[model samples]
Target: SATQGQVITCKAAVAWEPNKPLVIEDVQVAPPQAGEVRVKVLYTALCHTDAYTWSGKDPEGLFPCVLGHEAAGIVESVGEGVTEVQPGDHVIPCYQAECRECKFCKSGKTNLCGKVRAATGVGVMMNDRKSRFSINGKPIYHFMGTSTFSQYTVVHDVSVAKIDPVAPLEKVCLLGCGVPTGLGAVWNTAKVEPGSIVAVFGLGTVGLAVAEGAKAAGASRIIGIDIDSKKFDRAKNFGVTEFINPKEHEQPIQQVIVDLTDGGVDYSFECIGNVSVMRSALECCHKGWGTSVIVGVAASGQEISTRPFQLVTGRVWKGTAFGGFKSRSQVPSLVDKYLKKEIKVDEYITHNMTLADINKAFDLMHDGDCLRVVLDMFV
Candidate 1:
């Protein structure tokens, strides 16, 4: 309790406005309120969601905020009534909270916990509609309820998972978002059967994870589609058996996939977040039984389209959040899988930099030059 119940000053990358580089500032991190935990974030990785919000394209995006979610850290302290985790525990912050008592959590049909949804969606703490981070009395909104962009962040206890202490934080941080979303979509959402043919629409981190999941599920073929041919080579490491570039094809990308698979892929995933690509993803699935899972987060106000006959013909279309994995109860097992080397975590890192250099990571993401960039919050 050395630093307990006191304001801690730490550096954080504050998004003062949208479509701009974050400015690092010495911000005050308040002590955890009841049912919350304050974490000393060691490492965080950039995800497309972070970029989407930063680009000012997200209709729900809030500014003067701290934006980050994929991260690993240690619980520095806990607030009253917090019992699942304590100080010194290694943990991953979940943007999706699993308050086991909520109706959604108790449903056993989804990972979308109802707890804190309202506050998180609006970028504030559930307890008080306030932010734990501030600068000179100016409050900065919290992003996704995790906000690991700061050296220290306060998260709801239900939104944090304590993992094996021995796991390396830098690599396992990927579990906080992207990796799980991709893998969970394959294993949990689509449930790709053994010997199935799978098509991934984008070879970004999430798509690659879907490929890995399909491979592990004993898929016969894993096809990767991307406009950037550069990503194809690196994607091979994750289990892509074929590559398709829409730019090189005369026909529609979905038609090309259906033709290549001799009817259609058994499972198709849309990881690009493009509404048009989402339609293609749904249309490219095999008739009668093929399923398409939407793993991408499309921009707000965007709508996806496809002939209703496609569904009438028996192809299934569905979307997933956090890959349908219940964050608190199931994410720990994913970390165990990473620890056992049953999956690729270290292989996803294309770049690493200190927190001060985070904008460089954004540039790499925008240019499609890196799969993931891990940022060291403290040197």
Candidate 2:
């Protein structure tokens, strides 16, 4: 028998087309099906990826999409065959769900599992391949397969990780995406060694997370560079050991980094998707064993270039998504880390607003006034 909840009507932000602001509307909730669970979201954080898709930068982004991926909520109901979680559990939704039996999951070389992505990428329930959300009898495409902007969302059993119910949902929700992407990029992707010098380009949420991760990894020098000086204050709070306002140096960024790190840093992360910054990040690495990780999403058709010498000189270039975490395998440990205070999840939440005020959250992010803006679904 299917477990049921009161059919509720709630407001959600919907992106009907590219380059248009999301429209807030009321949508209906459906009961969970086999291997699926329905959640009553308490909070969600806005990310640049959301804005990029909404602004029509992602050619693959579907319209009428409910855009949100970083979210925390209470499980309202659990479907048949779902045993990993139960109703009333506080959980964070992971866009990439991992099935242990998959070849990639067994290898552990990457967190991406194609088994679950098949359903998530298409924005449909795993069992039925159909969207659970509808408005006035019309279907709405799901974003990142989670569609957390909605008050309530239905996802596969593997998509959520149960956490301590007592934890603050509003603050911890930042870990649902940005924290993992940033920190994981450093810890998992770059694997910076202790006493190493690290350079982070862009001071946004992901960049700050990378800085925090580098610090946690015992890096001796963490240099943060941003075109916007306003972000330095917040970036420093997140464990940036030094800040560089690109506008102040006047010299070429690559030269400044080379001078500071005594011939470039051991590791560099390009958290800004700008192609120019991408090149700078690559060139600002030490000649030998310097690893440059790209964690940002650039506009469609944008490309980054580097001289053949850059690669020949022993600088490794790599890219990461979801912080290279195998969702099901790593999310639990991340949540435990949050509970243990090893990673600072709450400090990144700079703004909190209601779901109706989601646009305002984006405005704050666009203006660089906030590191992370969360939407409280309860409001």
Candidate 3:
């Protein structure tokens, strides 16, 4: 117990049940233990995955939990044997941690760290399968290994990526999840080739980021697809060369793309979580050497299917999480992109609110009226 430091009480948005608004409450933030870090979360952003899990459709959702993966904060304390970081460091939380010693991390082929998978999936501490938060003497569970929705939260020391203090926390926090997932899918997963034709489904922040990623790779054409036409302008701004609305055509969206791109695009991305859209994304890729990467997470138990010929004919299908970034290593490079003005993260934020207004962020998202919404913990 002597490893502990002072206990700090802080505010947090507590989700007691699925498909319901979170209740704001005062919770006790305990000191860090070995391999842990206590962060004073300054800002957090709403993500679709957070909404998805909160909607009760995610099979693995464990309620009475704190949910937030995309966030930025200040380190408040460090546990024994923690030497890489210290109090007052600016940091971003990573749901997928890179411990550096895992087989996957050492392999260099992927960022899927095996050491914390089971515990992260269940929202428990990687150290002891316990939580550092509580209220009224009852334990409060963690979420996605980050739980940035709280004013203060505890995370595995390895799950944090220290960032440049000059970078605005509100803007860079989006990089915590969506932007990375989108941009990473292109650069890391598919390795989009220059002068290639690309098709993107959905024009949300993630989809737009995919377009931006393709553009950075020097793709000649980036086709943006969505049911709504209002998002077309932003998509164009992000380098989408064309826009396609499935509602305007009688044929399948895949057929429409096949005709428009003169035999399908060289690459395609599914930024929508709908299983049907995932199929269309896979089917619309150019038959030979084309790749379609799924960047969205479907509802629990939802399965996407297409004829086996899609694969046998030479089109490649795959998916990515957290944009294939290794938390401790690659995430800092992403912050450098922002530092150099090479990528845009500010545009994705459509609204800002205090922690008390976090629920409104979700409401704006559900109404399909906003992109990322940032919550300032001190406000």
Candidate 4:
């Protein structure tokens, strides 16, 4: 039986429909069910995907959804049979979960587990096929299974990883998505070889993480391309050896990378979903056996087209989500890496705001004033 507690009133930012900004509403939080855990959300960060969904760009996005994936919190309660995490444990919710026995989990080729993917689109727990949130009898769908925009969330134990209690929840929450996606794209998806040359398109949070990952992996040079000249300083701090302001360059930026790499870079990453930038990232890669990883989410109904010759030229194109990682199994190591100071999670957090100021966070993201806007739910 599910535990029934005093109806706790909580504030949350909710998107009741497409093309509408989130609304702040007070709602009731329920206790955890069997095999589930209740979390008191401390912080959540806004990613580009949130903006896309807010803009009606997510084709499958359901209305009346709570939008936030990267989040951190402390365990408030646990359902029967849950033992991996206990009350008071500080944790980061991995929107992607992995059940170890699944075929994809056993397959070494990819980190995506089938069981995890099954739960994502359902907007609720896979076992119950229901949401834990409601407002005056109106049900609200969970976004990516985290819904960190809410002050509290009830989720499966598999969807979260316990972190060091001493870690700053606000800062480390970014690691739940953006940081891992960028770093994993470089290290796991591309398997960037040491001393190799790499080019990253865009200087957003993800691109900066790729630059840092490339440098950490011992890449000889990391070139950052962006239209905004203001990102140059930030990019350099994250291990960009050369910065290319696409707007300022006279000739094609691809040609510049080709010249710098003595032909083209060994690896390239498309952190912006723009088709033009995607082409630029691929075209700037080394002619033979160069790997290009696309990490960006394009707008709804948009398609990327490339000449067949591009692939015939020995350039490989691929895409990644959550940095091509199985969150349940991989996120713990990511937290460890951040704790060891091997990854720069702190530096990527550009703005911090309260849940009431979520609109301002989105404004900053739209204006490109900050790489990430973290919402401090506890505040």
Candidate 5:
């Protein structure tokens, strides 16, 4: 059993600044505050967003903070008013909370809970605008409110989605962010019908998930797009019937898709987080009833714009975060889907190592050599 009010010292990865390697150093992790939960992080994944922010690119990114938005952990302690969770529960840290009370959460229109968002976006606990991590008595900011870079981290009670105890945290950690983002974009956001035409931009984890989701939903044709054809083979296993490399074609990729489909794809997804790709995703939709969803995060100051005529003709554009599933309430069922083999979780991990080799994961991802890298925090 975990003791309450204990100030524990543990090994943590400290991000001293932008473009700097995370230093694995000892740090003090204080007990949870009101409505907060202290967790022992067991496994974490390196998402592209983590790399983007760590590169000193995101406008809202803070410094001297731990960077990890997707991870799994066990609850160690709970602060006052945390009646929803207790010690020893397995949970996935959520960058977005499902409080189930906010107008946004209650409306069911989206999973973007407004109550904890303002505070979380700034990297502070909702109970107080402060952090519980410190190194040599110097306070360190939390990242995305769930900073799983440390062996131990404090998360707001609303920011942790308790999951099935039997689920493997190391593999399921992906559903905590990237995997769900893709599947959810299809099931929750776009709701692709059976036997529809689908086009996925970028064959990263998210794009692959999108293809998997479409295939799972009985999509007739899944066209995977990427400059790298090496990813096409893997994409085919996920139900991609066609592959397109924009670099190989003289004409714009959207035009190629339109000509192939005789009009456009019924549904399209932009998973590369590139502004230009976002436009192509929208432009390549079926003229009458096609829908396109944006699942990638653009860099600071990057924006997408398209001709007004595109929308006027009945095409729809939308975006998704965490696949539009309310974190606390719905992610557990996704874990169940994984457990039942309804979704493929293990197919994505291409590397495994200890936290000391964590930087290698980033390197592997940048070189387009890895889909995911799982890290053991204490090894």
Candidate 6:
């Protein structure tokens, strides 16, 4: 507790440049500024977004940055006027900030809170266009505000969700990104109805979370699609009743799905960041009443295209950010759901490694053999 109000020098996986492995270095973490909170990140999970940004493909990607968003931690200190969370509270750092009074938050139509994106998007703090992290007096950029790649990081209070204390931070850290994005895309974005047929275009963690939500919504059949046939078996545990491999099919996968479902599925999700797959997900939806939700993050400058005929036929196409969950207000309840065993949080974690082995975690994600890799930030 005495560490409050003092600079904390801690270990961090710093990305000195893009398209390269992160360098584990000792970086100075400044105390929180007004409306900001300093957190001692306990456990962080790697998401495709981190790898994407680290690849240098993200238009907003910044160099000499710390990049990890999905994490759970304890509030180490709070800046002036911060009230939503205080020291000792267990929490999750959210990329999507919810200030409650922000125009977007008050609008009630989106989870994209306007609190800190302007600065966070460009990799800095909101109060001042500067970084809270530095190495040898050289400023380093922040990633997605949370920047959980560090053992200690400063985030706006609006970006941290105080979760249930008893909930395992190691597992709930997944809630910081992928899990909620998938699960919320189903529960909040698509709202899969009872007895509806659902198709998830990717069988990764987010895709499986969508499948989990579909099952909870009573979707009669959940179809899992992936190039990796290996993902099919494990998807069954999350309520996937059918599997499809596009590589094995001669015709377009959409057509195959249309024929299998008798017409088309009631709901479809595109969890892969492929524009072509987004089209397929949209095209596979049932006519007149089908809804296709794009949950993937296409590369910078990449555009998705589908014939106007698809929309004209009454098929609805849309997308979601952070699964439409108001970060500060709704993320806590998600933790509660996990505590009650209503959702599969632990099941998503397939590997555990220390922060030093983070590069290996990225390798595992690329190999498709892992679901979520949790990093012990202290190590």
Question: Which of candidates 5 and 6 reaches a greater TM-score?
Answer: 6
lDDT for model 1, please.
0.92
Q: Candidate 5's residue-wise lDDT over 159-216, tens digit each?
A: 7888999999889889789999999999999999998999999998999999889998
Candidate 2 per-residue C-alpha lDDT over 198-275 given as tens digits, one digit per residue, 9 for 90 to 100: 999988888889988998899999999998888887777778889888899888898999998889999999998888
Candidate 6 structure lDDT: 0.92
Residue-level lDDT tens digits of model 4 in 1-379: 1223545569989898887777999977666777788888999999888878778878768878888888988888888888989988998887777666777778878877656445567677665677878899778888877888999888788787888787888888987899999998988899999999999999999999899889989999999898988889878889999988877878888898898888899999999888778887888888878888999888877777778897899999898888887776777778888888777888888788899999878888889878888888867
lDDT of 3 by residue, 204-281 (tens): 989989998999999999999999988897777789999999999999999999998888889999998889999998
Candidates 2 and 6 compared: the better one by lDDT is 6
TM-scores of the candidates are 0.98, 0.95, 0.97, 0.95, 0.98, 0.98
Better of 2 and 5 by lDDT: 5
lDDT of 2 at 330: 76
lDDT of 6 by residue, 318-354 (tens): 9989999998899899999889987889999999999
TM-score of 3: 0.97
List runs of model 6 lying over 4 Å from the truth: none
* lDDT per model vs. reference: 0.92, 0.84, 0.88, 0.84, 0.88, 0.92
Clashes of each: 0, 1, 0, 0, 0, 0
Off by over 4 Å in 1: none
Task: Show the lowest summed lDDT stretch of 10 residues, model 3.
Answer: 1-10
- Please, what's the RMSD in Å of model 3? 1.7
lDDT of 5 at 338: 90
Name the Cα RMSD for model 4.
2.0
Better of 3 and 6 by lDDT: 6
Candidate 5, superposed: residue stretches over 4 Å from native: none
